[PDB]
Homo-oligomer: A and B are copies of this chain.
Amino acid sequence: SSQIRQNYSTEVEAAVNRLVNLYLRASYTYLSLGFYFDRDDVALCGVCAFFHELAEEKREGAERLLKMQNQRGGRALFQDLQKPSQDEWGTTLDAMKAAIVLEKSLNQALLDLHALGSAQADPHLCDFLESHFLDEEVKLIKKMGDHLTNIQRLVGSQAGLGEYLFERLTLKHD
């Protein structure tokens, strides 16, 4: 039961639960991505750190959605979390490409939810999705696009060299 629910549709409640699953799935994918790059036969620690930071960010996003669900008087419903799409992630390039399509899928889900909020005349939802989701996604996707371009320019005739240099000179180890 709830004593607080107001202007919060069952459709939005369900969509928020689905978005939680998507964010948690993404976090799980990033956990796998990071550990792949820590394999002794891959050994690109800047890439491990990049994806593990994202694993944390996506988990935090899910947690924020869940906090909001409760703030509105909706009820969290958890579903199975499917395993990531790959067990091995190829090159840094392959991985960054997979990451961008993952992020575009999260972004599309955010846009779909915002559209639902608009259709349901739910401005609090609209306010909520603003900063900590929509702008963050745009910033992240831009960063990934920038990375992709730099990785691509580094392939040239010596892919191993370029992959090392990108991990050393772009990716942070702070």
* A interface residues (Cβ-Cβ under 8 A, vs B): 1-4, 6-7, 28, 31-32, 35-36, 38-43, 45, 63, 66-67, 69-73, 75-84, 87, 100, 104, 107-108, 111, 114-115, 118, 121, 123-124, 126-131, 134-135, 138-139, 141-142, 144-150, 152-166, 168-170
Contact = CB atoms under 8 A, between A and B. Distances in A.
26 contacts: A2-B40, A2-B41, A2-B145, A3-B100, A3-B148, A4-B40, A4-B141, A6-B104, A7-B108, A28-B81, A35-B69, A35-B76, A39-B70, A40-B70, A40-B142, A43-B145, A43-B149, A71-B138, A73-B142, A123-B134, A127-B135, A128-B135, A158-B161, A164-B165, A164-B169, A168-B170
Contact of A32 (B78, B83, B123): B78
Contacts of A80: 80-83
Given A71-B142, A78-B87, A111 B40 contact: no
Copies of this chain, count: 4
Given A40-B145, A123-B129, A35 B70 contact: yes
Given A28-B78, A43-B145, A115-B121, A72 B138 contact: yes
Nearest to A137: B124
Nearest to A66: B35
Nearest to A114: B123
B83 A78 contact: yes
Contacts of A71: 138-139, 142
A160 B153 contact: yes
A19 B124 CA distance: 18
Contacts of A162: 160-161
